[PDB]
Amino acid sequence: GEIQWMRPSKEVGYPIINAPSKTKLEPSAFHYVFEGVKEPAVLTKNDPRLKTDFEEAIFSKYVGNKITEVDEYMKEAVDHYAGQLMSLDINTEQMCLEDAMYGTDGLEALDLSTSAGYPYVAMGKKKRDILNKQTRDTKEMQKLLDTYGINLPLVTYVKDELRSKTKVEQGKSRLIEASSLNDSVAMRMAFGNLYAAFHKNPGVITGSAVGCDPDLFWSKIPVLMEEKLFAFDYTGYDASLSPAWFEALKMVLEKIGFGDRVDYIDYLNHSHHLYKNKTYCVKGGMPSGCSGTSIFNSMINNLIIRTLLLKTYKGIDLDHLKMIAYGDDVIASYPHEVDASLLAQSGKDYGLTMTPADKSATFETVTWENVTFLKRFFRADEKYPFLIHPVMPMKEIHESIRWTKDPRNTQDHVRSLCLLAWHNGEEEYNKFLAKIRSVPIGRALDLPEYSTLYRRWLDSF
RNA sequence: CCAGGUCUCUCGUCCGG
RNA sequence: GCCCGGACGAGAGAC
Ligand SMILES: [Mg+2]
Ligand SMILES: [Mg+2]
Ligand SMILES: [Zn+2]
């Protein structure tokens, strides 16, 4: 994905849009109790901890476009993935304006607590003003759509989130693209019934984990995979995608019944953004923040992966591929072992930078013991070996607990980390409750007992 | 006084059948 | 006791 230009937006009659200049993350009651190497992310160029040109670091990810042409391997990939989806019987009609705004089975309402994007952002206009959950009124949304139409530009923001040291020093903050409310509504009428089907069908048919619950889904996964695993992450996913893959997606969409709205994918593939004072244009790259981000990412991942198998392993039977993706994050399997270092190598050709799922340096043989998906390991219970624990490392839970965006949230936050930690077992969960209680405010919280969590888990089956 | 997207899951608070 | 739904908030995870 590549940047086509940049100019003060004044010079094209777009407003200047300046976001906050401070992190909302303050150190936690438990800041010294537990340890961590993570600090809040760079939000502005004038950030002391910076050891590089910020704005060159944030846009650094647009590494350009390798391919533009759907080659023969991508086509068979497209052919195979789409045939898979065909079995889901995905209703291919537009979704009515009411359900696109307000939600329906498989599709949540629009988040009323996030902004309406351009132009509303610059008019001091909010989704709340426009949307009414109680009435489900589409009248005013229709007016605005009539008035401002679609394909509006996306307002760029740096995510306020925790970040490692190298990433605070190399100014590697993550960038989100504020989709316009008009385009979310438009995107969801076109595609609501597709999003819905994906949400309802986590697993190896969709090749997507969107809609899953790790506490319950970890027990499904090993039974769904083939005998040997391989797994991946990608460096800069959204921004590493060339238009070739977007065409491939368009072709998939056409094949399953969405031919008429495949043009929405071009607005994704060639997009315009507003960032502080500038205004820029990108070709290729996923505008992370647009409706469908997760679905389209995960769908493309399924294409990418089929492609490389076809190109690296002649006579590979894709009907024995079993893979689950969450955006770039993927765990995959095949009846016989495959070499992720080779697949990755071929990957390099289509513009992809592929890694082990943990962003380790070198690929290892992937086993039910080392594999990770969404950061969690897999660990059979000791009493019931068919039930599998999603095991998130305490290291991650330690990082989280050390900060707060608001201290009035400590009960919920810390309680929520308990529902992740106890999968590390009683001995480690109980040591956790120790440290939390090693200070006054901890002893204020209502934390659940290992046995309560264990009984809920088992009962939940 | 507020600025920061698209989502999934879970927890919590409150209100319903 | 067991469901089912609603509104708000929070954490985690993907981008
Ligand atoms: Mg990535
Ligand atoms: Mg990932
Ligand atoms: Zn242009």
- The CATH code of the domain that includes A382 is 1.20.960.20
**Amino acid whose CA is nearest the C1' of B6:** A289
Ligand 2 center to A442 CA (angstroms): 32
- Dist CA A235 CA A61 (whole Å): 9
The answer to the question of residue A54 being in a domain is: no
Give strand letter and number of the nucleotide nearest A373 (CA to C1'): C13
The answer to the question of residue A428 being in a domain is: yes
Q: Provide the experimental method for this PDB entry.
A: X-ray
Verify that A357 and A336 share a domain, yes or no: yes
C14 C1' to A168 CA distance, Å: 21
Verify that A315 and A438 share a domain, yes or no: no
Ligand 2 center to A362 CA (angstroms): 17
Ligand nearest to the CA of A372: 2
Domain ends where: A226, A251, A284?
A284
Ligand nearest to the CA of A354: 1
Burial A264-280, CB ≥16 within 10 A → b, else e: bbebbbbbbbbbbbbbb
Verify that A258 and A234 share a domain, yes or no: no
- Dist CA A415 CA A412 (whole Å): 5
Residue A379 CB burial class (10 angstroms; 0-12, 13-18, ≥19): middle
β-strand partners of A279: A7, A274
Q: What is the CATH number of the domain that holds A306?
A: 3.30.70.270
The answer to the question of residue A235 being in a domain is: yes
Which residues contact residue A396 at a Cβ distance below 8 angstroms, ignoring those fewer than 6 apart? A375, A420
**Can you give the resolution of this entry in Å?**
2.7
Verify that A449 and A386 share a domain, yes or no: yes
> How many other C-beta atoms are found inside a 10 Å radius of the C-beta of residue A329?
21
CA–chain centroid gap for A453, Å, is 28
Verify that A123 and A172 share a domain, yes or no: yes
> How many other C-beta atoms are found inside a 10 Å radius of the C-beta of residue A84?
20
Verify that A163 and A77 share a domain, yes or no: yes
Ligand nearest to the CA of A238: 1
Both tokens of residue A270? 């060639």
Domain ends where: A367, A383, A400?
A367
- Dist CA A252 CA A275 (whole Å): 32
* Strand C-proximal protein residues, Cβ less than 7 Å: A 103, 109, 112-113, 133, 159, 162, 174, 176, 233-234, 236-239, 286, 288-289, 293-294, 297, 326-329, 374-375, 392, 396, 400, 404-406, 409, 412-413, 416-417, 420
**Amino acid whose CA is nearest the C1' of C10:** A412
- Dist CA A46 CA A104 (whole Å): 45
- Dist CA A76 CA A126 (whole Å): 45
| Structural domain harbouring A170 | 1-13+70-202+243-284
Verify that A309 and A422 share a domain, yes or no: no
A234 is in an annotated binding site: yes
Phi and psi at A331, nearest 5°, equal -120, 135
The answer to the question of residue A29 being in a domain is: no
The answer to the question of residue A27 being in a domain is: no
Domain count of the fold of chain A: 3
Verify that A252 and A161 share a domain, yes or no: yes
C12 C1' to A13 CA distance, Å: 40
Verify that A247 and A313 share a domain, yes or no: no
A146 is in an annotated binding site: no
C4 C1' to A105 CA distance, Å: 15
Give strand letter and number of the nucleotide nearest A159 (CA to C1'): B4
The answer to the question of residue A62 being in a domain is: no
Q: Which nucleotides of B are covered by protein (CB under 7 A)?
A: 3-12
Give strand letter and number of the nucleotide nearest A158 (CA to C1'): B4
Verify that A79 and A164 share a domain, yes or no: yes
Domain ends where: A317, A344, A367?
A367
Which residues contact residue A31 at a Cβ distance below 8 angstroms, ignoring those fewer than 6 apart? A402, A403
C3 C1' to A9 CA distance, Å: 56
The answer to the question of residue A109 being in a domain is: yes
The answer to the question of residue A57 being in a domain is: no
Q: A254: which DSSP letter?
A: I
Identify the residues numbered 258 to 297 in chain A whose C-beta atom is closer than 7 Å to any atom of strand B. 288-294
Which residues contact residue A256 at a Cβ distance below 8 angstroms, ignoring those fewer than 6 apart? A82, A85, A86, A90, A92, A194
Verify that A352 and A380 share a domain, yes or no: no
Verify that A229 and A120 share a domain, yes or no: no
